[PDB]
Design a binder for these strands. Structure first.
Ligand code: NA
Length: 630
DNA sequence: GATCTGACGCTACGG
DNA sequence: TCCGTAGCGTCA
């Protein structure tokens, strides 16, 4: 009542006093209110309602009394996001003060606690619009209890606010987050908002304490938190795509699939659903009985084993390829389009490895290598990544770590041969093809690197022999070859497993952890699975750590530069994709390289490697075609 | 009739 | 019985 104020209705002296209160506050506690009015504190991840406003709890304490007189203590202030029916001058004014207040929220020196901070920052950024850039939110730090709880239990599904309260809050704290207009009144909604913001503060503090207990605090602060505005910035931008080229390509791939469907129906001597794996399985081994010649799955390995036995596996393979490209990287990419561009949604809570994930579309899952088709009424090369074009004038600058996890593995194992080892998988592919590097095909590399991946993480002789098309004897032989050549990899794995048995958990370089209780399981498949998972997590988690660190450091570096406008557009694990203004390319590519390479040594945390990190830079007007640089 | 959904298989991405 | 993301399609 005196605890809730619309900042538009404040007298100007009270407005000034409010700005000063925000500057001198002990902590800010924030949630987004929708038109329901519901909050991020309620249970839905998707409101399916518009954003109305933002509520901020201003805490004076985390000494003496206080009388402001225009508000009580501690006050909740409300900031209208939603546009009114008519735009006019008073709306302009309201917007001016609102932007001032929200920016105060962004730059304030006290702790900011927001349940989902990325959403908040995105909303604020889009609210700034023209009077602000992405560099305004760059330094924003805010305490996201969901991220903390994720660091503690990465496996657990993304919990609601109430879940987090019952789990991490002691004790007997019951919240009502479910109030809306129409199931309740405004006063109920608001009272509950204030109470739940207090509770949110308490919860977040408790979770911070826990994070310190588990040794996750420094990781939380240095790595996860500064990443929050970076995701929001990426979600605030959009990558322009070819609506037109894409519709064409769609039509073409549709024609070709019609062809392939007809062919398959022909050669199987029946009309079966071309997209059905069940029916294909029944045909391939149901009738044809190919396994007996020399049931199994329809998977690419099996289908490649049978490629000479019958014309159907090859047909099916090509069909699956073309159908995937069209259905997913064309048609499904056309449905993600707004205004001739797309924007992915980023999830920091998505993985157990500490990796980022992306949705609608998944831009981390876009096929790297273009595919070839025979046009039905010349050869036709189709690259989905070629559909992603930079704005004009602007150009994409890509920067990736070369063989990041191999180098991580070198660091962790300390294998002398590796530590010795101008290329990597061209070397091994050359050694396997019994020829130099220069004539080695990219597909040979594609298979080989995947095979070293298989063997290092504990793959058996079976799956090994399968993926490279090897008889078991060459399987065990190749296993022993690689593991005896580099001894310290098995030692490292054996150590990681031992650690996971000891602690009941396994830990990455920067302290990110993967609890694996089934390491203690009696079931042997479960136990072995937990072991594989631990061994993989040390490396993949460490690399996730490093990639996030690079992301943050480059973002920060560009953030304070007066010249450089470079915007981080996408991240694909090992790779950072920037949209840079043309004349800024040389100066930007320089800053990017120097920054990412300096990652070899950063204090804190001790964070030192045994191997330099080679950064590969690329540039181009399209994501599909990027010419190497420098 | 036209949908909803949980589970599985296969395909891409990335190491 | 390499790991683990998303996405699309069949099936009961
Ligand atoms: Na007014």
């Amino acid at each position: 009542k005196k605890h809730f104020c619309d900042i538009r209705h404040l007298d100007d002296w009270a407005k000034s006093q409010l700005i000063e209160m925000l500057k001198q506050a002990a902590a800010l506690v924030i949630t987004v209110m929708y038109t329901d009015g519901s909050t991020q504190l309620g249970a839905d991840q998707t409101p399916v309602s518009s954003v109305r406003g933002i509520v901020v709890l201003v805490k004076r304490q985390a000494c003496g009394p206080v009388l402001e007189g225009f508000v009580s203590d501690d006050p909740c202030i409300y900031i209208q996001i939603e546009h009114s029916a008519i735009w006019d001058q008073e709306q302009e004014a309201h917007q001016q003060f609102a932007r001032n207040v929200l920016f105060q929220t962004m730059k304030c020196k006290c702790p900011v606690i927001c349940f989902n901070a990325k959403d908040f920052v995105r909303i604020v950024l889009q609210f700034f619009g023209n009077d602000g850039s992405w560099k305004h939110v760059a330094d924003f730090i805010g305490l996201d209890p969901r991220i903390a709880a994720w660091l503690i239990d990465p496996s657990d599904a993304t919990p609601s606010f109430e879940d987090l309260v019952e789990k991490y809050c002691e004790k007997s704290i019951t919240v009502k987050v479910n109030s809306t207009y129409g199931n309740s009144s405004r006063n109920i909604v608001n009272q509950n908002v204030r109470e739940n913001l207090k509770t949110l503060y308490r919860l977040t503090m408790d979770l911070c304490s826990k994070l310190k207990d588990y040794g996750l605090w420094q990781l939380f602060r240095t790595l996860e938190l500064p990443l929050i505005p970076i995701l929001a910035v990426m979600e605030s931008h959009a990558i322009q795509v070819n609506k037109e080229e894409m519709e064409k390509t769609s039509a073409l791939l549709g024609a070709r699939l019609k062809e392939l469907e007809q062919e398959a129906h022909f050669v199987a001597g029946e009309r079966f659903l071309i997209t059905s794996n069940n029916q294909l399985r029944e045909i391939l081994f149901g009738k044809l009985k190919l396994h007996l010649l020399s049931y199994p799955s329809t998977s690419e390995a099996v289908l490649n084993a049978l490629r000479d036995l019958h014309p159907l596996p090859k047909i099916i393979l090509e069909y699956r390829q073309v159908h995937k490209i069209k259905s997913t990287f064309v048609d499904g990419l056309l449905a993600c389009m707004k205004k001739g561009s797309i924007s992915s949604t980023w999830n920091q809570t998505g993985t157990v490895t500490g990796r980022l994930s992306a949705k609608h579309p998944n831009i981390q899952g876009i096929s790297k290598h273009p595919i070839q088709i025979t046009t039905p009424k010349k050869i036709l090369t189709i690259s989905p990544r070629a559909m992603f074009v930079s704005s004009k004038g602007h150009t994409f600058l890509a920067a990736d770590f070369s063989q990041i996890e191999l180098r991580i593995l070198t660091h962790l194992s300390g294998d002398p041969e590796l530590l010795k080892l101008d290329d990597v998988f061209s070397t091994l592919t050359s050694q396997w093809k019994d020829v130099p590097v220069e004539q080695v095909t990219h597909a040979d590399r594609e298979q080989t690197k995947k095979v070293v991946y298989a063997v290092v993480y504990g793959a058996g002789k079976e799956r090994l022999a399968a993926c490279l098309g090897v008889p078991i004897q060459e399987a065990a032989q190749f296993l022993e070859s690689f593991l005896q050549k580099y001894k310290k990899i098995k030692d490292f794995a054996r150590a990681a497993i031992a650690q996971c048995h000891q602690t009941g958990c396994v830990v990455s370089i920067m302290g990110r952890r993967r609890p694996l209780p089934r390491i203690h399981a009696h079931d042997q498949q479960l136990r072995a699975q937990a072991e594989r998972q631990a061994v993989n997590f040390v490396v993949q988690g460490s690399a996730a750590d490093l990639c996030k660190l690079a992301m943050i450091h480059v973002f920060t570096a560009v953030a304070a530069s007066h010249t450089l406008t470079a915007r981080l557009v996408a991240q694909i694990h090992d790779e950072l994709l920037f949209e840079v203004e043309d004349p800024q390319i040389p100066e930007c590519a320089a800053l990017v390289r120097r920054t990412m390479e300096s990652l070899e040594q950063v204090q804190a945390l001790e964070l030192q490697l045994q191997v330099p990190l080679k950064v590969s830079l690329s540039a181009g007007r399209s994501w599909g075609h990027l010419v190497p640089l420098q």
